[PDB]
Design an enzyme around this catalytic site. Structure first.
Site, PDB file in Angstrom:
ATOM      1  CB  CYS A 140      -0.937  -0.030   1.214  1.00  0.00           C
ATOM      2  SG  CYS A 140      -1.579   1.510   1.612  1.00  0.00           S
ATOM      3  CG  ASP A 157      -1.919   4.101   3.710  1.00  0.00           C
ATOM      4  OD1 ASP A 157      -2.105   5.186   3.162  1.00  0.00           O
ATOM      5  OD2 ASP A 157      -2.854   3.374   4.071  1.00  0.00           O
ATOM      6  NE  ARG A 198       1.624   4.373  10.935  1.00  0.00           N
ATOM      7  CZ  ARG A 198       0.882   4.137  12.020  1.00  0.00           C
ATOM      8  NH1 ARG A 198      -0.186   3.342  11.948  1.00  0.00           N
ATOM      9  NH2 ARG A 198       1.208   4.698  13.185  1.00  0.00           N
ATOM     10  CG  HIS A 218      -0.627  -0.944   6.080  1.00  0.00           C
ATOM     11  ND1 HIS A 218      -1.191   0.076   6.810  1.00  0.00           N
ATOM     12  CD2 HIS A 218      -0.598  -0.512   4.797  1.00  0.00           C
ATOM     13  CE1 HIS A 218      -1.515   1.068   6.000  1.00  0.00           C
ATOM     14  NE2 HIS A 218      -1.174   0.735   4.770  1.00  0.00           N
ATOM     15  CB  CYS A 264      -4.632   0.364   5.896  1.00  0.00           C
ATOM     16  SG  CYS A 264      -4.842   0.728   4.210  1.00  0.00           S
TER      17      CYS A 264
END
Ligand SMILES: [Zn+2]
Ligand SMILES: [Zn+2]
Ligand SMILES: [Zn+2]
Ligand SMILES: [Zn+2]
Lengths: 183, 181, 183, 181
Positions: D9, D11, D13, D65, D68
């Site tokens: 993803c 995102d 992280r 994750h 998210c």
């Protein structure tokens, strides 16, 4: 003078919109694609849907499926026919979503059942596009229809689908599937 | 079962369906804004696969049309959400042929671009694996590109017309060449 | 705590953003794709571009190309490698657009030239998305950068591209191509 | 040249890059909102082709994750333009497994869906011509699906893990089955 009714038929040389309808020639925006789909992430279609809602300011969208349909057959079979496999994987997910219901029917009758589920599901997709939501939610008039055409019998007096709002989209969609499930 | 695939614009004014003097059921239609064939468009490439491989079509026709909503919107300067993304492909074409179209009158551009567009879409069509392969396995496939001049009633062969990759180059290059008379 | 810098690198295991930059770990949205493209009609990317502009409210987008790059090589060669051909046809149009300029260069040097044109063209694409236009035109801060990384030399002190507005996008883009054309 | 393709993803992280304990240059990364593989997405299918065919990868990992952005946004009820289209695919998944997720607590859903998502993306991955073909020509290709629990630091094998179409069915069906404990 402007069109007032968008038709979304199948590329399968079916739903000659023109001819099946017989309303005022010149007032019919048309788009056709394999199995007459409205996919969440398809610019081609959504772009039409947009032009038709935002620009030409249409107030009707028929999605029209048909029976004995190549997309559906292709979708159900296994031949890897290249790109079209990708496209039809979307239809195959619909088949999985209603597997139980379809999963008990003379296999002949399944293609036609799936043709019908599909018309419901695409309206349901169409209805959840920002395009359409935005339109409704800004007080614009817009009706959605899901019909299935048969070459032998004409249009099936079926659970059509019919949606003039977010709230009605739901009821209709549910009712549609609910209704198809009885055997 | 049908021998032609028709690729028209969604704009409603090109009902090929009768225009031609051919038939329905011999006609497999796909219609979309500005009558484009984009390299990465699954919707249409899908129509073109089913056409070429499943039905084994012999002719694919891309048909443009005069004063076309899509074309006008492309050159308009105003956001219309999603449709703008789709129309950037036609702006890229516009820029491509900018000089030519500057050397031209504001209201006459509309039409020119309509023509160019058709030329360019056919070139796109002819570079797709789908079409490049029909050809290598020796299938009969000809690609035609026309503009419907809604005003004069009549269609018009733009004489892009290709039957191979080599015949694709010649028509395309010749077309662009000709549209800078 | 939120990211502030979107990176668009090449899927070619290149531009390890992380590592090439060295800024604050956790403030770097990344998207990678073959030849690091921004195509007008790609939901995948645009969706990232959107999340990053509208939601995370980022103010920098680097598009980073690189030299000796598989996409570019693939783009220039002829092997029909399936789907990826479609994707790269977009890059091949860029090659046609600058054919004359490229069309007079030691063929070795062409791949690297095209790598650079590309980074310019994608910024130019990025800059013409409704996403970005909307953002600027509503007074939000957003800067765009086009850089090319080389494994031997690091980042080329090149005609970078740099755009903080619709007007600057133009100048920059033109200047970029203008600058590349000198030989 | 690299042996893994990572599909994460956007995102931020999930920096797999070190997370793993493997390498870069042995890692070919594609990142997108909600870490999806859509049937008709050229962007990603393209990464997956180059991976599988050009580099001849042996493992494709889809990594989800916890908390998210994408997942949360999917269940949010608020238009964000284009991103909404992309996220409808994850809503369809949500609905699909609705009962399961109703039988569940409002803030715990987030995470579940994150898991389900991974399961479902792997099933998508494994139905692509690309992957179905690597397999038929007898290439070594395993597909793995993990969630990074950003909270506890550690990754987590979801034990979707497939090496053929048959092994794809078993893991998938078993995963969904297990996530209605
Ligand atoms: Zn059909
Ligand atoms: Zn038109
Ligand atoms: Zn690269
Ligand atoms: Zn995420």
């Amino acid at each position: 003078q402007t069109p007032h009714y968008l038709w979304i038929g199948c590329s399968d040389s079916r739903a000659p919109a023109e001819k099946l309808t017989n309303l005022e020639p010149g007032e019919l925006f048309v788009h056709r694609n394999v199995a007459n789909q409205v996919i969440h992430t398809d610019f081609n279609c959504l772009s039409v849907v947009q032009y038709a809602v935002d620009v030409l300011k249409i107030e009707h969208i028929i999605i029209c499926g048909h029976t004995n349909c190549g997309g559906i057959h292709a979708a159900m079979a296994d031949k890897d026919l290249g790109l079209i496999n990708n496209w039809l994987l979307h239809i195959r997910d619909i088949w999985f979503k209603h597997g139980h219901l379809l999963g008990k029917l003379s296999p002949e009758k399944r293609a036609d059942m799936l043709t019908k589920i599909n018309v419901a599901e695409q309206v349901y997709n169409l209805g959840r596009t920002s395009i359409v939501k935005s339109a409704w939610e800004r007080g614009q008039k817009l009706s959605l229809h899901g019909w299935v055409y048969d070459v032998n019998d004409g249009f099936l007096v079926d659970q059509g689908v019919m949606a003039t709002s977010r709230e009605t989209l739901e009821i209709s969609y549910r009712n549609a599937i609910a209704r198809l499930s009885i055997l």
